[PDB]
Design a protein around this nucleic acid. Structure first.
Lengths: 140, 389, 75
RNA sequence: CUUGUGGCAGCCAAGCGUUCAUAGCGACGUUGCUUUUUGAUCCUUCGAUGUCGGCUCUUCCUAUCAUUGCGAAGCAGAAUUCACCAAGUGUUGGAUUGUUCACCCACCAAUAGGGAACGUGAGCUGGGUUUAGACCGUCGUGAGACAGGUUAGUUUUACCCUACUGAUGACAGUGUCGCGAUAGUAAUUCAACCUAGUACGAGAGGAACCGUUGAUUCACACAAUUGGUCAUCGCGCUUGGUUGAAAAGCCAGUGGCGCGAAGCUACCGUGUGCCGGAUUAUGACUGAACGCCUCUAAGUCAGAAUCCAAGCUAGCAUGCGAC
RNA sequence: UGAACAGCCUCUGGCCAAUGGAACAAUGUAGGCAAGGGAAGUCGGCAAAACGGAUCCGUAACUUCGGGAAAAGGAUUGGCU
């Protein structure tokens, strides 16, 4: 029967280049003591046959903490990708890409699970998730 | 299942199933909207030749998603769409075997029109003064013949159609000199009025502005670029077979099952790709115009500065546009230097896609990679030349 | 001419809107590259004065110069 | 072939379910269907039908998991559960095992079930099974054997004929423009916004219809842009060697390297992908049979991801018109 | 050139005969390159690919003390004067 909605992100607004498949290692951009996340799955996606689930900037993502402190370690938490090195296309038509690939660990409430961001945050991420926005050192 | 219960949607549509060479060089729409509207100004289609593509920036307006309003880049196809010489009013009566022409009327003065037309249409590339078309009738015999058709039309209520031809000889940059004869349906009012107008309408050109209104959703139909012969992977969109090495890479594995002793029509294997008739729907006609004596160019300062719609250095492998231009939304089927036909959307509904017009800001008619935007910037580069440039 | 524009932070040229590539750096700086030639230089770590295509070069000459000194046993 | 054994679906209804046999279930039994378990059989093949799995791709099936549209409810909202028309369209990625199967992780509208020589080897892989080498354990006096484990071990041939795919093409000649017979046929799913913190509810909580926008997956194009490609050996750079040097170049099976137009190409770029009718399920009308009454008997209405047009693609080459 | 009887280029000696021409399609075979990601592919990293020469620095639990060891890991390397 029908699973009731909400959670999974929402309808992006663009068509976006997939940069991070499953089993990628991706930087932790918060100061929980975690300093490497592992994308295991994508929270919202429907895929198909043979094709690896891939995630991109602003998406709701499923991640486990690969390394850092043992309290964060080996727990599964939702994450939002804050940066990806693969270009994102804005409506105006400029292509924006980031230096590194990073996500933060996020609470199921969509509030940060981390004390503060480091580095810039995509405008897209802020719109969808306004509590990542209010944790932001920088919004570009 | 039978085997592996992890199943995929089928690669390559069955509604785009025979991927094969088009019968004619110009797409021909096999039906048209019904006569229900304004008088024979309303041709249901017009023809042009795909000049290339350019780009336009337009300042949106919507509210549903997060970002809306503000500038947006867009791809637009530029098509040269010269005014076209309508040769004749043809009487097709509907029959219970579909439409049947009773006679075809040809203009009173053809002597260059049919003579440029003739290296297909007939054959031989204007050599010894030959390739023959019928010469104009006895003076009152031919006029009587035309009016005999009027009677036949006006008793069974004929679906009025027009034979026209594309005068490509008004263009220069496109190396073909050969007019393409074609059928464009005439739509409008009552049978008596429309036919009467149609006789007078072959004695004069029809421009771009008189067949399409701006903002309109127009279905664009052409024949795709010929690619040649192409693999399964680029014809049906099947996966490569994955291994380190493998005796077939770009291949499908199995093309049926043992008991039906016959290969399906639906299984994916190689063959011709490109040069296929295709319809691509619901294209916003942003702008219609022409060099000097239709359009201005642009309105100066903020609107935009005047920029000719050709890119400097001309369109690759086409020629240079210095005539009619038509801005039709996004991609358009075909290569360049092929007939593309525009035909009004069958789904007259519109609904909300654009609806509202969306004032032309930038053209991106690109002269860049270190310079450009006509005249002054070109002069700046030329300043760093002069005596060897 | 153009009234809405960006500016290439390498090659100097005006970048049309709906054009170019913008690098977002990890320290939140924005670098504007007109085309693929512009951005390759930055990635490779070219100073624009290092004769790239000759970006932020273009500096003034002087003239010729005297035959004086530079070791030639005078005082 | 058969259907014990297996799977699926019924009939009866003692009970369960606060009450109340039948919302949802259902004992003791009992009737079917299927070949989606496996045997039984030896009918067919051993002067030869290539095993299993996976990789890939198709078609079909419905006993339909989802979605479309509906009828039940111990359906207040809502989760959820039941039944119907329906294969139109989806039905997943990984970890491990040769295993399909299995079992987890994790997404999700949904992660249905089955078949097609146990679909699929002149398409592959060759990991399993199943040779020759070999190790260990057990059994054996031994040789050897093992429904026990373990490792390494050759995948031949299409150019014939058909199918199918595309290419041409002789019927007065020569050629055009049309017509449209018939065949193929397509869009999919989701979230946000609004509705709405509303209906509903005691509260906790908490919709959908409609209005709006984009995504997801698929399909069809195109190079504006953007990204990729380099044999423009185009330009620059660089090493070794070679023209005494200079200059301008040659050789290194394309010397190497940085760039590079034009061309091609990427949900690694963009844009686009149709709406009328006829009906189903199902609720209905009027209304008998059955003076009343009932969706039905006659007549009849609204109605679906359906179907057929519309539309789109082949263009009847053995249909035809006008010229 | 360089450790080189390595490779590459050339001398000297020896061929110019590898059927020739045209187009240079798909598909093969053989050779390269790919943004972002980085073994998620697959029975399995099979080979492609990367590392690679040397000088200096640095060098492990362990060990039959002989080794591992070129462990790992880094930096350096031209023309010319």
């Amino acid at each position: 029967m029908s699973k009731r909605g909400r959670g999974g992100s929402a309808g992006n607004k663009f068509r976006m280049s997939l940069g991070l498949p499953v089993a990628a290692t991706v930087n932790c951009a918060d100061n929980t003591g975690a300093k490497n996340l592992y994308i295991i799955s994508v929270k919202g996606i429907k895929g198909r046959l043979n094709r690896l689930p891939s995630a991109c900037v602003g998406d709701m993502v499923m991640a486990t903490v690969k390394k850092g402190k043992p309290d964060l370690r080996k727990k599964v938490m939702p994450a939002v990708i804050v940066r990806q090195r693969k270009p994102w296309r804005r409506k105006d038509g400029v292509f924006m890409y980031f230096e590194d690939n990073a996500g933060v660990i996020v609470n199921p409430k969509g509030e940060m699970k981390g004390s503060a961001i480091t580095g810039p945050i995509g405008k897209e991420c802020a719109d969808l998730w306004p509590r990542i926005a209010s944790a932001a050192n920088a919004i570009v | 299942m039978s085997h592996r219960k992890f199943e995929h949607p089928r690669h390559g549509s069955l509604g785009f199933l025979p991927r094969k060479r088009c019968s004619r060089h110009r797409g021909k729409v096999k039906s048209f909207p019904k006569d229900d509207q304004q008088k024979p100004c309303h041709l249901t289609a017009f023809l042009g030749y795909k000049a290339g593509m350019t780009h336009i920036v337009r300042e949106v307006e919507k509210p549903g998603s997060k970002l809306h309003k503000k500038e947006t880049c867009e791809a637009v196809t530029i098509i040269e769409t010269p005014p076209l010489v309508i040769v004749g009013l043809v009487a097709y009566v509907k029959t219970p075997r579909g439409l049947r022409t009773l006679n075809s009327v040809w203009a009173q003065h053809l002597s260059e029109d049919v003579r440029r037309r003739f290296y297909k249409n007939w054959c031989k590339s204007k050599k010894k003064a030959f390739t023959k078309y019928a010469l104009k009738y006895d003076s009152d015999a031919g006029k009587k013949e035309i009016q005999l058709q009027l009677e036949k039309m006006k008793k069974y209520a004929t679906i009025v159609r027009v034979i026209a031809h594309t005068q490509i000889r008004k263009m220069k940059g496109l190396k073909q000199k050969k007019a393409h004869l074609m059928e464009i349906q005439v739509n409008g009012g009552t049978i008596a009025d429309k036919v009467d107008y149609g006789y007078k309408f072959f004695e004069k050109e029809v421009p771009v502005e008189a067949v399409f209104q701006k903002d309109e959703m127009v279905d664009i139909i052409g024949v795709t670029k010929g690619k040649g012969y192409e693999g399964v992977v680029t014809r049906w969109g099947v996966t490569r077979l994955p291994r380190k090495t493998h005796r077939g890479l770009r291949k499908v594995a199995c093309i049926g099952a043992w008991h039906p002793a016959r290969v399906s029509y639906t299984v994916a294997r190689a063959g011709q790709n490109g040069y296929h008739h295709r319809t691509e729907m619901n294209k916003k006609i942003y702008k219609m115009g022409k060099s000097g004596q239709e359009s201005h160019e642009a309105c100066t300062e903020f609107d935009r500065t005047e920029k000719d719609i050709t890119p400097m250095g001309g369109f690759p492998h086409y020629g240079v546009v210095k005539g009619d231009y038509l801005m039709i939304k996004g991609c358009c089927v075909g290569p360049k230097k092929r007939v593309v036909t525009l035909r009004q959307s069958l789904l007259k509904q519109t609904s909300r896609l654009a609806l509202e017009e969306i004032k032309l800001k930038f053209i991106d008619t690109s002269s860049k990679f270190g310079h450009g935007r006509f005249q002054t910037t070109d002069e700046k580069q030329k300043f760093y030349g002069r005596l060897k440039a | 001419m153009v009234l809405k524009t960006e500016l290439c932070r390498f090659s100097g040229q005006k970048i049309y809107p709906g054009k170019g590539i913008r690098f977002i750096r990890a320290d939140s700086q924005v670098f504007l590259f007109a085309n693929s030639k512009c951005k390759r230089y930055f990635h490779n770590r070219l100073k624009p004065a290092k004769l790239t295509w000759t970006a932020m070069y273009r500096k003034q000459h002087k003239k010729d110069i005297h035959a004086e000194a530079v070791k030639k046993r005078r005082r």
